[PDB]
């Protein structure tokens, strides 16, 4: 009731917001990352949870690399939330500067499906470079479970919500 929000479906509500202050007001969630194929959290969302965590997130994430190796486009690793959410979905959304199909976030957005509740930027729409628009009819498609999907700019929110 305090944000703008849309609630566009049975399943996903659209907020104004940041998607970090959205995870803390709930009891419990997943909160998912827009990461890379190694995750080295960088200049997006990703370094904001991060720093919003004191380096542990990146600290984990190294751990993981070592034990996985560099994970596929569109694959997801499900790492310590850090008291930030309940847990952290790291998401390699498809990179459009270097030619990776939008179509691979069908793979990202299904990785949400056996979580109860998800909070979500909208995957490579930033510096990826997929239009969000395009990020939005994805998630929209593929997602089937309660998901706060929290955007931060006001253009991109009215946007989606007409
Ligand atoms: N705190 C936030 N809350 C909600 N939305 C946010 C926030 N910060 C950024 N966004 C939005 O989330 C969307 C995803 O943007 P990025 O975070 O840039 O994600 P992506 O486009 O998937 O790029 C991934 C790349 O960026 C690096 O941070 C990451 O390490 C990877 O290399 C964009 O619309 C961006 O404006």
Redesign the pocket.
């Given at each position: 009731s305090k944000y703008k929000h849309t609630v566009i479906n049975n399943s996903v509500t659209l907020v104004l917001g940041?998607?970090?202050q959205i995870a803390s007001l709930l009891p419990k969630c997943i909160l998912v990352n827009?990461?890379?194929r190694h995750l080295?959290?960088?200049?997006?969302?990703?370094?904001?949870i991060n720093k919003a965590s004191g380096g542990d997130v990146q600290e984990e994430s190294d751990e993981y690399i070592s034990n996985n190796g560099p994970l596929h486009v569109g694959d997801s690793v499900l790492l310590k939330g850090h008291g930030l959410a309940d847990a952290i979905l790291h998401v390699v959304?498809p990179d459009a500067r270097n030619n990776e199909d939008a179509a691979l976030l069908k793979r990202c957005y299904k990785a949400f499906n056996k979580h109860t509740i998800v909070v979500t930027?909208?995957?490579?729409?930033?510096?990826?470079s997929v239009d969000?628009k395009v990020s939005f009819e994805y998630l929209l498609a593929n997602v089937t479970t309660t998901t706060y999907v929290?955007?931060?700019?006001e253009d991109?929110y009215n946007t989606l919500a007409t």
């Open positions: 940041d998607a970090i827009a990461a890379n080295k959290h960088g200049g997006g969302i990703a370094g904001v959304g930027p909208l995957i490579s729409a930033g510096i990826f969000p929290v955007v931060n700019n991109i």
